[PDB]
Assembly symmetry: C2
Homo-oligomer: 370 residues x 2
């Protein structure tokens, strides 16, 4: 029954953009008279560049262009139709709701999640979504939001950043949040955004474009976050919790053996009773509570992910619209999508049952996509 499903695909809905347009501090959106597309500005390191362009428009247009590829539902359906994708499970892109004031957050989250549901209702059977949460609000407001989003048509989970409530995912205050999501049977899609402190990339990083933070920072951030969750015993505390990890777990399948070795050889952990004989290894968690997307661009990475979680726990994604072709027509097929489909083919064989599972059937089963 080989239907193709994309579980890693993003949008900024109209209500989200309008919310950002009203903002007077980062992140925010400005509409310039020169260009046709609004400007999303996130990191303060480019607010200076805005002033330049707001004065000498000869200065480059700052930040990211809010293109049709981010904002347009019709564009999303076009991408799907021209890349052989039947179903998309869309999610709000970074920075989600993390920056909002505690009082305004639940209301804004409500309207945005409402719009995602309505967007999905436009193309019944082809669109589902992960909801984002007002994580800057009190935990009680977060729990009320979870009970709300689970009753929205076409909602199939939660997209979660690595900062959690502000102290990362090993924050003890997040445990009732994880419990609430797990009990509601919502899959948690963990996604990176904050990367690594730019200092790690050295004085020449600018010369390499965005290669270092995107290729290294994001997947390393994911690895660190899940490792922290694991070490804190989150997976043992909430046994029904299920995680989908962005970019094949970042680097987790490659480092899992090293993680295990470091645990069992850690003097502090062993001597304080933190390494009991019956402990659930990261390998066990990878097979029982973790799903991995297949956004890894090579059969090498993909094979490691499959060995770690199993072919029934890998899910095809594209990370649309983050990697458009630079020279080829953006309205034509995207090689950033094709690269991952090719990786799947090279790893498990075209037309195989494993291929059908990874390309969509795992997502249909796990997320009840009807």
């Amino acid at each position: 029954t080989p239907v193709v499903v994309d579980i890693h695909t993003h949008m900024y809905p109209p209500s989200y953009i309008a919310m950002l347009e009203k903002r007077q501090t980062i992140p925010l959106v400005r509409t310039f008279p020169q260009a046709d597309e609004p400007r999303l500005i996130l990191l303060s390191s480019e607010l200076a560049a805005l002033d330049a362009a707001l004065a000498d428009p000869a200065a480059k247009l700052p930040g990211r262009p809010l293109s049709t590829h981010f904002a347009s539902l019709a564009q999303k359906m076009h991408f799907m139709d021209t890349n052989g994708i039947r179903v998309s499970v869309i999610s709000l892109a970074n920075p989600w709701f993390d920056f909002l004031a505690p009082d305004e957050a639940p209301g804004i989250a409500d309207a945005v999640n409402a719009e995602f549901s309505d967007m999905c209702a436009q193309h019944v059977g082809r669109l589902f979504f992960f909801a984002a949460l007002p994580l800057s609000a009190p935990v009680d407001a977060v729990k009320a939001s979870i009970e709300r989003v689970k009753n929205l048509k076409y909602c199939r989970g939660i997209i979660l950043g690595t900062s959690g409530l502000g102290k990362g995912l090993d924050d003890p205050h997040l445990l009732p949040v994880f419990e609430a999501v797990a009990d509601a049977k919502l899959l948690v899609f963990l996604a990176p955004h904050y990367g690594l402190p730019n200092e790690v990339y050295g004085p020449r990083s600018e010369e390499y474009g965005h290669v270092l933070p995107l290729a290294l920072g994001f997947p390393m951030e994911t690895t660190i976050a899940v490792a922290r969750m694991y070490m804190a015993g989150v997976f043992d505390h909430v046994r029904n919790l299920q995680m989908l990890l962005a970019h094949s777990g970042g680097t987790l399948p490659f480092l899992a053996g090293r993680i295990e070795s470091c645990i069992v050889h850690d003097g502090h952990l062993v001597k304080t009773g933190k390494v009991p004989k019956d402990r659930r290894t990261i390998w066990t968690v990878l097979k029982e509570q973790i799903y991995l997307d297949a956004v890894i661009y090579s059969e090498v990475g993909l094979q490691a992910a499959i060995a770690s979680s199993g072919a029934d726990r890998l899910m095809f994604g594209t990370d649309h619209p983050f990697f458009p072709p630079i020279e080829e027509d953006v309205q034509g097929p995207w090689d950033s999508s094709r690269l991952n489909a090719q990786a799947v083919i090279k790893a498990v064989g075209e037309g195989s049952s494993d291929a059908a599972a990874v390309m969509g059937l795992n997502a249909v089963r796990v997320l009840s996509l009807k």
Copy 2:
């Protein structure tokens, strides 16, 4: 049986420890009557507890103990004999010479490298070494040290930290060093130490012991350093350069596909002609100028490493003495050694030519042992 070679194994030699004992600032070594081992003090935070133990024989011993596992050649030979290792290619452990003053550095590097050669001479055919370089000194002094160490008996390469001269491996000033080492036919062993800024691990990190900095920090640092090297075109500028990467390239075999995709989809690089059609991909460099150690603890990671560089470019290592058994006899076989040996077996099969290659024959060929 075919020779087992350990290419990833560390020591602090007597001359290195003696030098550290004379130091007044971090890093330094102090000995105590109430302790049978010298103390390695490496952090500014530890200086506080030092004066306490320096005052009271009652207070706690600061820093980490300099055990025989780090310091004794007999202990190294015992480890090899009880873990089935015929040949070790030993190297100075972090922090090497990175902290030394520019003028004092070349002299200290000379004495330490000389002692390494002499140690190897005590067990002919079983010991070779990677030399460490005085990288805090002017490049001319570094090149001089390079020409010195290549004529030392049993020297088979160079150990290099990720900081280089102090600005990472994509520092233009480091290009003459890479050229000098490559021209001298010395393999460069790249090893981590600086990890990642501790803040990335969050406020609970100490509860997890050293798991996060060791399991994540070290290999991620290696990945970042080599990625920077590659993006700067170092491998293209020095075509005869050969580098051995610690911990199976850190995470490189897993992220190589993502790196390539990010390069070809980078607007700034493509539109400035830095992505020409004839560019050597990271996959090509992984097969031509990179060797990977097999210190990866799982056949999952090892298979990814083998797929990336080939079975003829993987080399067994133990990272001795960094992961001793915590409960089991430290004088018996090390779990941290056998995990990697088992990983080789489960990946390529026991008794296979690939197993013999990874376990030592690659190192014999590449390092002329």
